[PDB]
Amino acid sequence: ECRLSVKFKYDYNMEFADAFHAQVDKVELYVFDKNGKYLFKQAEEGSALSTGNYLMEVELPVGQYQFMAWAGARDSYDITSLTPGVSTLTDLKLKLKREASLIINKRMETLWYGEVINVNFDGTVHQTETINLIRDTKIVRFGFQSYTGSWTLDMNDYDYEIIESNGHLGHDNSLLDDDVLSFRPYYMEQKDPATAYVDMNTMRLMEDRKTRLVLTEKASGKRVFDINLIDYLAMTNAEGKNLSTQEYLDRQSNYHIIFFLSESWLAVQIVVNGWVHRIQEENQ
């Protein structure tokens, strides 16, 4: 007669505060048993989640379970379909959809990973479990300007890519083996050459990856800029906070980076969300 409820939170962000009700409009809870065998999933989405008091009511027999979730997953992603009593956690995988070209140029609906929890429900009390959500999709606005302003960098001369094989996530949120994808702008603006920017997005930024930002000249097809974005972000100060690289990468999901370049396409300095950082030539 007692009921088991699930609370979802999204406080693992740079505001260190829960933004679930404000940002997450779909949760899908996966339930596995004592043995790690899949039992079912349960999806809810829409206005219910926005109240500030959303709880998911989960009908479950007395017993021990593991829960995890994916939140926000809609048309951009294929999540494997599991068979009750047959499949286990390691069967659950999420893959960003791509065509043969391996180019992604759409803005994906924001994706959150719900960490795995052990749940022991004996039916004697009303109980609420909490799912903790980690943002996996990362939005970046890039600007490119002359450091001395002695030449005008024109942003429509080039193509822009973020290159990584981060499009296949396991049940533990780890990057599975996958093809390397080319993430390219979903929006570009050069109204004021000083205003000018491209908006891009990618999947998880990992401290142990070497995710690349690559610019290619339309005219020649020559690559003019090729940097390790993870490394450029690691060199920074996590926006003044006391964070490990991975924690900053997980917590922050909007990155507005201006590159101030030499005439020879060397980054002299970058500005990441307002923070100025000199790039040491040896680490360019």
Numbering used by the authors: 34 to 317
Task: Tell me, in the authors' exact words, what the paper reports.
The BT1062 gene of B. thetaiotaomicron encodes a predicted lipoprotein with a molecular weight of 36 535 Da (residues 1–317) and a calculated isoelectric point of 4.8. BT1062 is a member of a functionally uncharacterized protein family [Pfam PF08842 or DUF1812 (domain of unknown function family 1812)] consisting of ∼80 Bacteroidetes proteins of around 300–400 residues. Therefore, the BT1062–BT1068 genes are most likely to encode a fimbriae (or pili) system similar to that of the minor fimbriae of P. gingivalis, with BT1062 being equivalent to mfa2. Thus, DUF1812 is a collection of diverse proteins that are likely to be fimbrial components.
The selenomethionine derivative of BT1062 (residues 23–317) with an N-terminal His tag was expressed in E. coli and purified by metal-affinity chromatography. The crystal structure of BT1062 was determined in the tetragonal space group P41212 at 2.2 Å resolution using the MAD method. The structure of BT1062 consists of a tandem repeat of two domains: I (34–170) and II (171–317). BT1062 is composed of 21 β-strands (β1–β21), three α-helices (α1–α3) and five 310-helices. BT1062 is likely to exist as a monomer in solution, which is consistent with crystal-packing analysis and analytical size-exclusion chromatography. The most significant additional structural feature of BT1062 is a small β-sheet at the domain boundary formed by the EF loop of domain I and the BC loop of domain II. Domain II contains a three-helix insertion between strands F and G as well as a β-hairpin attachment (β20–β21) at the C-terminus. Most sequence homologs of BT1062 and Mfa2 contain two highly conserved cysteines at the N-terminus (Cys25 and Cys35) located near the tip of the bilobal molecule. The conformation of the peptide between the two conserved cysteines is likely to be flexible since residues 24–33 are exposed to solvent and disordered in the crystal with no interpretable electron density. The most conserved surface residues of BT1062 homologs correspond to a short sequence motif 306N(G/D)W308 located in the β20–β21 loop.
